[model samples]
Each structure stands twice: as structure tokens, then as C-alpha cells.
Target chain A: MIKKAVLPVAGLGTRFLPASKSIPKEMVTVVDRPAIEYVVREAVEAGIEQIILVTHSSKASIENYFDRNFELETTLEQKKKFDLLAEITQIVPEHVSVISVRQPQPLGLGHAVLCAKSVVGEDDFAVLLPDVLVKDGSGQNDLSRMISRYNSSQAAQIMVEAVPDHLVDQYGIVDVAQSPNEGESIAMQGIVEKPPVGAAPSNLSVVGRYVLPAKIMQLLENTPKGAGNEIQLTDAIAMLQDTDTVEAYRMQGQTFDCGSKLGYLKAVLHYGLEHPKLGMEFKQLILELK
Target chain B: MIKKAVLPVAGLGTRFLPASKSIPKEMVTVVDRPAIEYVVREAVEAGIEQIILVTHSSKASIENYFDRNFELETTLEQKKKFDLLAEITQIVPEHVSVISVRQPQPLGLGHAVLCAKSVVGEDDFAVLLPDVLVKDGSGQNDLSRMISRYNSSQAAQIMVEAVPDHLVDQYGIVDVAQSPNEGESIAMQGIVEKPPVGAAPSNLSVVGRYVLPAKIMQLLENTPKGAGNEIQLTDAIAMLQDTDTVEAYRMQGQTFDCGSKLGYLKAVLHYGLEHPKLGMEFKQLILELK
Candidate 1:
């Protein structure tokens, strides 16, 4: 069972500059809570028991968020604000523990995951990128399905979503002879990061969620810094493919690149409209604004 | 000249709950930028050269937002994202200096302003509440006009807007024997804090913008803790009226209380539609959502 999830959030969100200049891109509010909260909740729903945050020096707020705020909780309890108190205290379940490990520099995604090796210890874990939000419109946990596939087949699961060939160069495309059907996993050659337009091996682009085995961590330790002088995670995954079968799990969900400003706005709109308490009012607001 | 503006953002926004639990309410984005950015931009348009932020420990993100991010700037410049680079670099002009002061406790608004006394020195300053975003449909700088009125009349200007009698109790109503016309300033006796229905002196309620003389700081020093056992800025203004005339300036703009959730949404819609780059696409999205 995949009992742990690692979230790499150390990158400076250059696309979301000015907005993400101070506030972590992951910390931007989608509607009522920070964007990263949704990702964390997604992991919990997938039955992940431990959350390891691979963070930077500037991201203490992310750590403070999941932890208890005795001052705020006491005030809410005293005022009998039960609704708010429950929301504050239950950000993460009692069974799930959140731990933080800081990446010393702007090293890259592989370096970020490697920083969590000690905490992860020999356990197979999931890696979730906070920059992208995965929404299962069909009311299912895609990550859970990916984990299930990994368990059943003993193959590493790399979540992927179909993208148009013309824009495939913008993402890390999987190299498979044939793309798998939605919610299905297929063995892949490897991932091609930002392939040239019309030259991508497949339209199934990697969607930032990876269900990996513990051996990949060891492989990452031996992998040299690839592309851009930073330790690229894709390079480690490529090395893992030499010894094991890595499968591309086609995700049946929508991905929002919250790293971009416009993408963040789109996520806000979608999440805002689906908000339980504010959905009707938000819909009305949209109509009125139109 | 009121060349300095003080923005009091020290309060723990209980109303904003879970969202403001970790993120400062002022740091919440209205559209592409944080809500407080609009307030600071308003001050700049009013010809204010210095921005004084009365903040709490948790509100460091607010200060960091206005400061330079050299790494981010270099990345944007290298990527040739000139539009975004300009936006990042010009959050505040070269002439404007953003200074921050710590408000040790969650004292009332008066105490927040008093904390900035050392930075403000003896200069008359404008106080712009970051929670309230005032949008002028007429394309006029309302704060600039308030400062102009303050200089000409030698009276402190308190921004006000007329509210219905039924809703008057929810606001701090001004004691103007007669309400002033829009964009005009009239002598106010004092402000009544949430007067009962049919018992209120006037319909005009205080908005969160104030153009005051340096003497108000001295008055705040002697003013006892009012209403909530916190130093109320209104109480100090009331005392200042005993020695000098304080005028209520009827603002010619729409005020959105970003401190509240619904109000923040409304401001987002308004500002998002007015955004130069994303306005058209945002409008289309609004129509699509409807």
C-alpha cells in the first residue's frame, strides 16, 4: 500500500510572478482554502497516511497551516464557532501525519524527492506536484486508481492526460506505442519532456502525479544532473525503466496548472462554482457579471 | 501634503476563516493581484510617496509582496516575459517606499495606526484600509480629492457613504446633521458606532478612507479603549473634533469590503473584468459559466 505522499513545492513560480513572488503558488486560495489544501485532501482521499512536504526556506506558512493553531482553536472553541473550529482542526485527519524536509537550493524535482529519502525510508510513496491540481470530475480518486494499478501489476504508475499533438511540446509526453484507455495503465518506453511540435511520441502527457517504488529513490541518488543543470525526475524515471516496467496510467480527471496566473483563475472559477456553501451564489455572480 | 499612507492590516480576519487562517486576508488575490495591492495603488494615485504597513507577525507576506524579488525578475527577463516582468517590477514606483511596523497585539484600528507614528513622524498622512477597495467609476482619484479637501478646509476628512436606515446599525454612522452631496465634504459632529434603527443621527456611514492631520496621533495617545476594550480609531477622531472641525467626505465611488467573502468575490469580478490583458477572456468565461 502506498502510505506516503511527497509534495515538491520549492520551485519559484516564475509564471505566477508578482502573485507568487511572496505567496507560494501552492498557497494561493482557490476559493475558501489554499490551492495546496485540495492537493493534500486528494492524497488523504487516496489513503495516503503521511504527507512529506519538500519545501524551501520561504515556505514555513505551508507547514504552519497543517499544524494546530492553539490560539485560533481556543478562540473558536470559546466563541462556540463549531463550524469554523471543525474546519480548522480537521485540515488533515488525526491518523495522517504531515512532515517537512527542506531542499537546500533550487535544485529540481528529483533533488526535491531525494531530500525526503530519509523520511520515506524504504516505503513506496506517491509524489504530487502542488503546482498542478487534478480534479476528478467523475467523482473518483484518480490517484487511488493509479495506486491500485501499481499494487496489482508491480509496475510504477505515472499519471498522464491526453493532450493535443500541436501543444504536446509544452509537457512531458509519455513514449508508448499505443496510448492506454482512460483509467487504464499501459507499459511505456519512457517520458519525453517538451518534445518538439508534432514530434511527440504520444499525446499522453505526464500530469505530475507519480506512484513509485522505493528502489527509484536509490536510482535517483546515483542519477547525474540531467537537463538544465538540475536533477531532473524524468531522468531517474528513465533509469528505472532499464530494470523495471513503468506504466503510463491515463488519468480520468482535469488538470489545472496553477503555476500560471490564468490557470489559477480557471481553477478558482471551477472550484468556486462547485463550492457547497457558495455554489448558488457564485453561479448568480457569474451571470450578473456577464 | 499627505504624502504618506498608512494601511492597517494587523487584525486576524476571523470573518474570512479557514481562508484567512493561514493566509492574510489582505494578501488574498482580487484577480491577478492581492487585494491590498489595489489599496496601495490607490494611495500611489493619490500622490502618496510613502506606504506604511501596520502589520502582524503572520502578515509578513503582505510586506514581501511589495518588495523586490530579484530572482523572479531575472527569470522573467531571461524568458522575455516582458509584460509580466513590468508588472512585477512596478508594483510600486521608485519614489514610493514601503515601510512596515509591527502591531504586537490584535488591538483595534487606532493602535495599528499609532504603531506607525515613528515612521510617519509629524507629517499628515492618509489612512487607507486594505479591507475596503473603493472603485471610482468616474475615473477620479477619490483619495486625492479627499486630501485636497483636507488641505483647503484645514479639517480632517473621513470618507463616508450613505446607507439605508435599516442597515445603518451594521455600520459606524457619521453624526452629520445634514448629509453631504456626493464628492463633497461637510462638517460632521461625530461618528456614532452602530446606532440603533430610527435612533441614528444621519444616514451617512464611515467608509475606511481617512485624510487626517498629524494631531490625530496625539489624540489617539490619550483616547481610552472604547467599545471592545480596544483603542477605536473613531474614539480618537471624536476627541479630535472637540478641538478642531472634522468633515465627512462623501465619496464618489463604489466600496467593496474585501474583508468579507462575498465582498471579495464581488471585487474580483469587478477588477477581473477591468483587467487589460485578461478582461475579454474573463468576460467570456463568465458568460460560459452562466
Candidate 2:
């Protein structure tokens, strides 16, 4: 059971630069909540109560953001702004246990996952990259679906998406035993990191969602630094693949990598059009402007 | 007259969240142009021809925002969208030269400025914090006032504002020599960074505007990193206090720190009130809901 999830957000996030100057990328907003909030909501809704945030020291803002502030609550209450107070209280779930572990250095994703060893020890947990915002989880949540598959098959799951061939170099590509159900899912064989277009194992590239066994964390310890002089998470996962115990779950719903400029703007446009109160007018204004 | 300005935009701004995740806080829009673009416009108005952006690698969106995109411009021109094309073309002044320097690490704000040494090179340059948006600068600019004061004394100048005592620790506190011209400008004596509440140097704290001497860059080279293990510009500037050339111009116009969440919301409200077509309707909607 995926009762816990690890969210690694220690990267310098220079991709967002000045906006990221003082804030972690995970805290950057989408509509009302920042990406981190939405990501947490997804985990909470999927029945995961414990979330370990792998963070950097400068990322106290993320921890503080999820934690409550008594002063602001009091100020809002005194001013008779009951609704605003209510919004603050509901920012974090009551049952969700928030744990934080600091990754002192800006190493790769594999090293980030390693930092959470003490908290996640011997627990088969999920690893969620907060930057990947899985859209339309209001119906059948992606993580929930992945967990369901993991429960039945007892095989670990890695989320893969069908991306364009040219963009294969941008993500970890997965080669899998073809699904008899016509590619709805695939049995995992191996994974490659950012291969060239023609050289890709398959067009199915691993997205940021994964449900791995606790033993995989053990393998991450000796994982040598890969292409970027940093330990590659995919490399660690591939070693786990040699154990013949992993499967690739084609992630349900649209996923947006909010870590990139173009991706974030698209999310704002897509999700803004779905917002109940502002959707109608926002859509009309955009169309009219167009 | 300032011919060049250094805008250090390398901080990870967590305040504006999701919106700032992939975009610089400065790129978050006010009405039309991103806040940074507006800052650039103000600098251009004050006769700054060489704008050096001491930035991180992830600020390509900003570079794209300012650079004239031939493809986008060609398409806009071909599609008969002359107004949009004109808007795109004029984002940067014709004579203005845009230069970018990469700040490889997240040091203090002072360290980011130090990275621009080669480009700013021995010139009395302006330092404008892009996050601090000065409102109503169309009539007479704030930098204009500081430069006027700067031109007269040829002294290293820093901008100061009267902040609340409790919040004095949030900024670099300044101890100024008595101003003979009431609330106008003062001869800066000693400055302290985020002083303890009761022991604040003065009620006035430095805002992110400065017209500094060329030699200050040389001093920044060896200024020991303090406070958060990052180079402190205030410390370097204080080293020049013995030379008795430091002055403070009480900056004109209301400044908003769009880098923060609360400040951003405030900016959205105030600027939304000032936006043309949507202003009236947005104000009415907000008021009616309220």
C-alpha cells in the first residue's frame, strides 16, 4: 500500500530564475493554490497520509507555507474575515502527516530520494515529483489508479507517457514488454536516460510519478553518477528492473510539467478555463482578444 | 547620468508560487508587461542605454520576453496584427543594449551584483531590484530623482524608505546623517543589515534602488559573506563610509515588492484597478462578491 509519498524539491530551480529567487519551484502558484498544494491534495485524496518533503535549507518557505500561522489566522478572525480564515485552516489536511528532510547539496534526483531514508525506511512508498501536475484527477486519480494496479499485480509501478519522438531526449525513456491490452499499460523491461530521437528504446518516456519497493532505495546508495555528474534516479530504477519486479503504468489524465515556462503557461490557460467562477468570462475575454 | 544599470534577478522567489515556479517573479504580469519589463521601461526613461541583467541560467523566458523574436514578430506582422507587433518591437529601446551574466550559485543579492563586474566595468552604474516596482513613474521617475541627487554630489547613493520598526529587521537598516532638507535626502553614514528590532540604526531601511560608484564593485570582491553565508553589499558599502561619500535619496513613488505573495496580490488589486478595459469590470466583480 502506498501510505507514504516522497516529494523531492531541493533543485535550485534556476529554470524559473527570479521568480524562484526566493521561493522553491513547488510553491509557485497555478490558480489559487501553488503546485505543491495541489500535488499534496492528490496524495491526500489517494489515501496517503504521510508525505516526506525532501527539501533544501533555503526551502523553509515550503515548510512554513504548509504549516499554520497563528497570527494571520487571528488577524483575519478579528477583522471578521471568516472565509479567509477558513481558507488558511484548510490549506493542509488534518490527517496528513508532513515530514521534512533536508538535502544539503544540490545533487541529482537519486541523491534527493536517498536523503529521506530515515523517514521512509523499509516502507514501500510513492515518489512524486511535485513539478509534474497531473490534470483532471477529480475523477479517477492517477496515483490512486497506479496504487490499485500495484496492489493487484504486486509489481512496482513507474508512470510513463507517450511523448513525441524528438522530445525523448528531455525525459527518461522506458522500454517495456508490450501490453496485450493494446498499450494501456506495459510490463517494464528497462529504462534509458534522455536518449536521442531515433536511439530511444521506445516512445514511452517515464514521467515523474513512481511507486517503488523499499529495496530500490537500497540500490540508490551505490548508484554511480551518470550523465550530469550526478546520480540518476532512472539508473537506480533500471538496476531495480534487473530484479524483474517493476511494471510501467501508463499514467491516466493529462500531466503538465509546471517546472518549465511553456508548460506552466499552458496549465494556467487550461486550468483557468476550468475554474468555475472565472472560467466563462476568462474564456470569452481570451477568445475575444484572440 | 547613468548609462548602465545592473538588475540582479537570481533569487528563488517562493512568495508568488506556481506563477513563479517556472517564471521569474519579475515576469509575473501587472497589467500588460511583466513587472521586470516595466522596471526596464523605467530605466529606459531615465536614460539607461546599457541594461545588464545579472541572471541565472533559467531566465530564458525573460530573455525571450525582452528580445525581439523574429518568428513571432513576422507572424504578427503577416497576420496584420500591427499593434501587437509594435508592442513586441518596443519592449526594449532601439539604442539600449541588453547584456546578461550568469550567477552560477545562490549567494546573497550582493554576490549576484558582483557577477556583473566585467560588464558594469568601472562605470557609476544603477542597481535596480526588479522585484521592487515603483508605481506612477510616468510623470517623474524615482531613479530620476536619485540620479539628480547622485549627479550633484558624485557620491555613492542608496535609496531608503521609512519602514515600521518591527519590520526594520526585514531590510537593510540605514543610519543617516541628519537631512537639512526635511524628508528629502540625507548623507548616509552607517548602514546595518536586518538590525535587531529595538537596536535598529534608524526607522529608514534601504529599498533596492542605488546609484553606486564604480569602485564599489572592487570592494564587493572581498566583502566577507555574512548573515546567511552570502556576500553582504551593505557591508561593502559600509566599508566606504570612512571615505564619507555615501548619500541616501528618499526614493519617490510607492514601491511594491511584487516578489512576495501578499505584495503581489496587493499589486494585482491596485494595478487591476488601473487596467483599462478589464479594470472597471474586475473592480465591479470583486466589489460585488465582497
Candidate 3:
């Protein structure tokens, strides 16, 4: 079972600096909870039982947020503020365990994932970047479906979503002999990083969700320094494709790269509009603004 | 001269519960900076030198945000990221001081102001509720105008702005003997707390900014608990009105109550559009959304 998810949150998040200076970028609020909370919820919804956070020393608050706060709960309960008490205490599910492993250096994504090797021993796992938040539009979450796809085919799943044709050059476009429709999977030949403008294989860009077997951990160790002279996860995935199938699963949900200031604002707007109790008032305010 | 401003950030932001559960509501970012930063900037722009934050034990981060972080500064400086370094180091100017006093309990606003009496001493001061963010539309800031008016007329100034006549009953409508024109001040009879809809004296409502004499501190000491059995600040203001000339200064700027989820979103939209580096892109995104 794919019950473990590794969230790499070790980067300094230069793009979101000043705001990210004292507070970890993962702890930045989207609408209500921190953006990392949404990513964690996504993993939990996908049946992840243990969340492995590959984090930096500076990011202790991210771990603290998920850990239990007895004093806070006692205060809230004493004051009869049950709703808020539940919100705080129930951040992580009772069944799920949140574990943190420090990434001692500013290495690449692959190195960060490699930090979780001991915890993820001999098991298929998911790698979710905390910077990106994926919102499910409807019934099943995207990650759950990716895990299901991995189960049926025994192939690694790399989540992708269609971007506009013009913006295709800005992303890692996946290559498949035949492209899969939305919410489906197809065998990927490779990921052409920022392919020339109109010379792309498909408009589908990597959405930063990966479901791989335990062997990818072994592959990441052998992966050399690639782009940016850092150990990249994509290089290891490419190596995995040499002998085994690495399929591209086109995601059905939307994504917000919360690492960027503008993207974080966008996430707030979309998420704020859908909030149960606040949505109506938020919508009214938006109309009043225009 | 009104050189010191008291910002009451002690009350739990119940309206923003889940988001305010762990982090102080003042520490929640509006766009690139925390919402309280904007309020602090407004106070500084109006020539306030000392910002007295009547805060809670849980709100230490609010103070830390303004304080220096040598480690973070050294790291950013070593990385040679000057733009971000400037943003963090220059949050509050060297000329301004940010001080904090603890409000031991959830007393009303009057009690919050009373907590800062020692720091305020025998000088006239400004009280700004951190929950309400006021944006300058143009020209001099509204607080500066109120301070200037207080200087010239020697009357305690209570900032007010016109809401819709229909919506007047939803606010603490100021009963100015005669309504002051926008950006002007006039003698007030008293503030009518949520008066009946059509029976309202004027559309002008309290905008949570007050420039007052040190004597109000004495009045607050004798004021009894009023609405919700809490020590209401308006009750103390009413006491001041009986003994002094308290005038309502109509504000020309806009105000948003960040305590409410919808109101916080409104502030984000307005502030995001005017951000120096991100404004163009944010505006484009807003347009694209529509």
C-alpha cells in the first residue's frame, strides 16, 4: 500500500521572501489554514498514513503546527470554544503520523526526498512538494486516482496537467507516444524540460505529484547532479524509465504554486470563494468591490 | 503632539477562528506582509513615533516581526539578495519604536487602552484597532488630518466615515450635533450604538481611529462594563463627551475590518493591487479572472 508521502519543504523559498523570512513558506495561510495543511489534507485524502516531512532546521513551526498542543487545547476547552478546539486538534488525522527528517543542506528535491529513506524503507511512496497545493474540483482527489493507477499497472505515476499551448515552454512537458486524456494515464517516453516554444510533445506540464516504487529511492542514490548542478528527482525518474514503465497521469484538479506571491494570492481567491461559511459573504464582497 | 499610538490587538479574533487558531490574526499576511504591518505603517505615516501594542501572550510574533533577526539578516546578506534583505530589515524605521504591553484578560477595548496607560503617560495619543486597516485614498493620511485637527482645535477627535444610510444601523453611528463634511470635524452629541435604521442621526459611523487627550485614560478607569458585559471603549468616550469637546472627524480613506474573514479578503484585494513589485501582475490576474 502507498501509505507514506514525502513532502519536501527544505527550500528557503526566495521567491516568497520577506514574508517567508521569519515564517516558513509552508506555514503561510491560504484562506484559513497554512498552505502546507492543504497539501497534507490532499495526501491524507489519498490514504497516506504517515507524512514524512523532509524539512530544514528553520522550518520547525511546520512540524509544531501538526503536533499536539495540550495547553492550547486546554485553554480552548475551558473556554467552551469547541469548534476552534476541534480545528486545532484535528489538523492531522488520528490515524496519520507526521514525521520530520532534517535536510542538513540546501540540496535539490532528489536529495530532500533521499533524506526520508530510512522512514520509507521497502515501500512504495508518494512525493508531494509542499509549495504546490492541489484543489480537487469534484469527487475523488487527483492523488488518490494516481495511486490507484499505480496499483493497477505497477508503473510509476507522474502527475501532469494541461497548460495553455503558449505557456508550454515554461514547464516540464511530458512525452508519450500517445497522450492520455484528462484523469487517465499513459506511458511517458520522457519529460522534455521547457521544450522550444511550439516544438513540444504535449501541453501537459508536470504538476509535482509522484507515485513510485521503493526502487526509485535506490535510483535517486545513483542519480548524479543534473540541472542547476543539484541532485534532481527528474533525473532519477528518467533513469527508472530505462528499465521500467514510468507513466504520466494527467490530473483533473487545479494547482496553485504557493511559493510565488501571485500564485498564493490566486489560491486565496479560489479557496476563499468556496469556503462554506465565508463563501457567500466573500462573494458579496467581491461583487461590492467591482 | 500625538506621537504615540496604542494598537489593541489583545482580543481573540473569533470571527477568524481556524486561521487565527495558532498564529496571531495580526501576523496573518495580507499579500506580501502581515496585515498589522499595514496598520503600523499608517500610524508611522501619521507621525507617530512609538507604537504601543496592547497584546496577548499568544501574539509574540507580532513583536518579533518588527524586531531585528541577526541570523536571518546574515543569511540573506551572505546570499547577496539585497531586495529581500531591504524588505525584512526596513519593516519598521529606526526612528519608530514598537513596544508591547500584555492585556491579562479578554476585557473590552476600554480596558485594552487602560493597559497602555503607563506607556502613554500624560500625553495625548492615538488608538488604532489592529483589526481595522485604513487605506489612504490620496493626499495626507486621515490619521494625520485628525491629529492636525486635534492640534488646532484642542478637541478630542473620533474618526468617522459615512456608510450607506440603510447600513448605518449596523455600526456605531456618531451623533454629531451637525454632520461634518468628509474630512472635516464637528461637535458630537454622543455615539448611538447600532441605532434603528431610519431613526439614525447621520450615516457617519465610528471608523476605529481616535485621537484623544490623556484624560480619556482617567475616564476609562471609571467606566463600567456596558455592552456584552465588557468594558466598552465607547462608554468611556461617552464619559469624555460629557466633560470635554469630543468631535467626529470624517475620514476620507477606506477602512477594512481584518477581523472578519470576508473583510480580510477585501483588504487583500485592495492591497494586492497596489503592491509596488507585484501590482502589474496582480492587476493582470484580476482582469484575467473577470
Which model scores highest in DockQ?
1
Docking level of model 3: medium
Candidate 3 lDDT tens digits, A220-275: 89988876646888899889988998999998899998988888988988888889
Task: Please write out the lDDT profile of model 2 over residues A1-290, one tens digit for every residue.
Answer: 77989999887554443244334667666654566877888888888989899987656656766677554556456557676566656666788888999887757889998898889888888999998888754576878888888788778888888888789888888886563232245677778777877888777877788888888778998798886647778788878877757888886578777766546655655666677655675555444421
Task: Provide TM-scores for the models.
Answer: 0.94, 0.57, 0.90
Q: Where does model 2 exceed 4 Å of error?
A: A179-184, B1-290
Ranking the candidates on TM-score from highest down gives 1, 3, 2
Best model number under lDDT: 3
> Which whole-number lDDT from 0 to 100 does residue B34 have in model 3?
80
Residue-by-residue lDDT tens digits, candidate 3, B45-151: 99999999999876777887898877677868867998888988888889999999999988789999999999999999999988899988787899999999999
**Docking quality tier of candidate 1?**
medium
**Interface RMSD values, listed in order for every candidate:** 1.5, 10.3, 2.0
- The DockQ score of candidate 3 comes to 0.49
Q: What TM-score did chain B of candidate 2 earn?
A: 0.92
lDDT of 1 by residue, B90-120 (tens): 8889999998889987778999999988888
Q: DockQ numbers for every candidate?
A: 0.62, 0.05, 0.49
